[PDB]
Amino acid sequence: IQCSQRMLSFSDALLSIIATVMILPVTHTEISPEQQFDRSVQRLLATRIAVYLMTFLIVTVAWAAHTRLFQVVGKTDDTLALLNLACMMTITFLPYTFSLMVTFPDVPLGIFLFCVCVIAIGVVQALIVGYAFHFPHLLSPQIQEPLSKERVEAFSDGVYAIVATLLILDICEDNVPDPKDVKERFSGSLVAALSATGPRFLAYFGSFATVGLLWFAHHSLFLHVRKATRAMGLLNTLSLAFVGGLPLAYQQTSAFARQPRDELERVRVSCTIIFLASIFQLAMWTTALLHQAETLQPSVWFGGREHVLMFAKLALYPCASLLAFASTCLLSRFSVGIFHLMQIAVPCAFLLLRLLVGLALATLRVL
Amino acid sequence: IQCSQRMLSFSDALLSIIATVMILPVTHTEISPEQQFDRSVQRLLATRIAVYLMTFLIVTVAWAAHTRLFQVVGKTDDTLALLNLACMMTITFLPYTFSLMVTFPDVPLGIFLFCVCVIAIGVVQALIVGYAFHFPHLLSPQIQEPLSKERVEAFSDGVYAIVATLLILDICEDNVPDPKDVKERFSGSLVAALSATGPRFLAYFGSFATVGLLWFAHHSLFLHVRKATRAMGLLNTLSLAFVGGLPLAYQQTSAFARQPRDELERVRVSCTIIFLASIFQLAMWTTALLHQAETLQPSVWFGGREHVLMFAKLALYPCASLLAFASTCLLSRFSVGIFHLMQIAVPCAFLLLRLLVGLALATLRVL
């Protein structure tokens, strides 16, 4: 008999790493062709984004299946650990096979490989469940559609950590100035190179800040949750999938815009991405409020002490993004500045969210 | 009052991601120049490896400092969460600053940036501890040099997951055949492209298998540990640092060798890397046996039921790597085949480790 907490955490980390692979090309796509070749570049970017979304959804489905399989198996063992490692190895091939299918649909080989991989995952799961059943003491006490809070929390943390640090990873990978390049192009001055590369640092700053605040809201929301239903899991997975686009949005926004209208469009895209990312969390919290009796703790129940605080925490980002999106069309002159100042305002509001909520209560109550 | 388990897990994931950044160039270095330019390529690879080791050690030190800081702080809050996010953001800049220092030592700016970043991390930690002290109820109950098992386990799992899936990440990133390339170069046949790219798949297979078995041994060892001392933490960090070289070793080994002696040298390098990775785990287990009374559970005590099983689990890899390294010089003709068959033999022994240990006991007892 062995505890499965560490094993399940490792499996969640592996699944989170695998799910977030196809984002890497998307962030590595050239910023601007500079030769007004927008057509092909946009088509390639759209295809990559669609492929990434599809693989993320498929890996999420596989992760949910694994979570259920190990939920019906209470305990673990060395043989079960080896079988879990094998299952993770088989699952890891899904993104590459899906990409091979998508880019080369005409050939009948990619679909064959995908079917083989799915059948292999099924076989590993069948072997795991059979081994567990052959030994009754390794099964769950009850047996021997709620989800598990720990698995969802670990997957969300892994996804958020991967998304937040992507830009810094790329910067460390490729944004190290070369000696002779600095000597010749920039008159042998490092400060010039740092100034040139600053926009990437600003984009990383913004992306990391936004992702960190979103993760903080996610953690605050999930702390006060007792039971996680399948609908909440689906909404959380959708929110995580839409979160992966934040680095791309910030890279596009921070990049120099040829014309002001291009900057307005980039800000609109970033605002839409943020709104989509946060509205799913809001919707999942409403789905939890639907039956707090079986979902939330008494503290965050209707009329609770922290009910309004949680409302504000989960509505700060959606509402602000909506106002920014509206201003992008209402004023159309300070929209870029509005987004820039909002990027610094939202963290301040989150830090002072308690005092701001108290002031809002004081002013609305006697208004 | 809020629980810090999720927050500490997220911090550990971020720190593990940051620590394992500089490995990415190392695995992305060109396999063979093909123009007998071994000098410059080898110098660049050695410099990259040294930089990676240094950054990993520095990030490990920072992670240990953070672990102590949050150990003296029992509970967390929204303000503490924001401060932790800020501290992680400041820490994330360490690898890039260290690289800037190393590549450009002559200029006095990289050292200034590194000092500024270290001072910033110190300032964030000071602010965190001051805020915690200002509110007594947020401090640890005892206050209001053992380590934490959970933090070490999470960091190890993150590092292992990152290392294992690096090769598949690269394959998905860059190893997707192009339509016209297949049409023209390979006579429009996808099977030819897959056969050409197979060596990378084999290298990923080997690396993932080895890393997974090493992680399984790590989990089995750490399950039976009550208290983790600083020496065990240092040994585990050294083992993790040396584990990061496995993908590079497997990439070099699977790559076509110009001459047989090159293949022998590559196998020697891979065997040495594996031996270094596993000997540190063995040494840390011996350091735990030093005072099992305060370190291990009674089950794995001297003369315990699982003592010999754990001995075999932790000595299978070191001993086998030592025999392979010896054979690389003794026979010098089947060394490559010896390594290839060992790669498949070791997982089988691990799977049947219980039965193999029983047979070994039966044969040694009455021998």
Ligand SMILES: Nc1ccnc(-c2ccccc2)c1
């Ligand atoms: N996608 C990742 C990358 C690195 N680490 C993790 C992780 C680590 C510990 C617990 C949960 C998740 C996830």
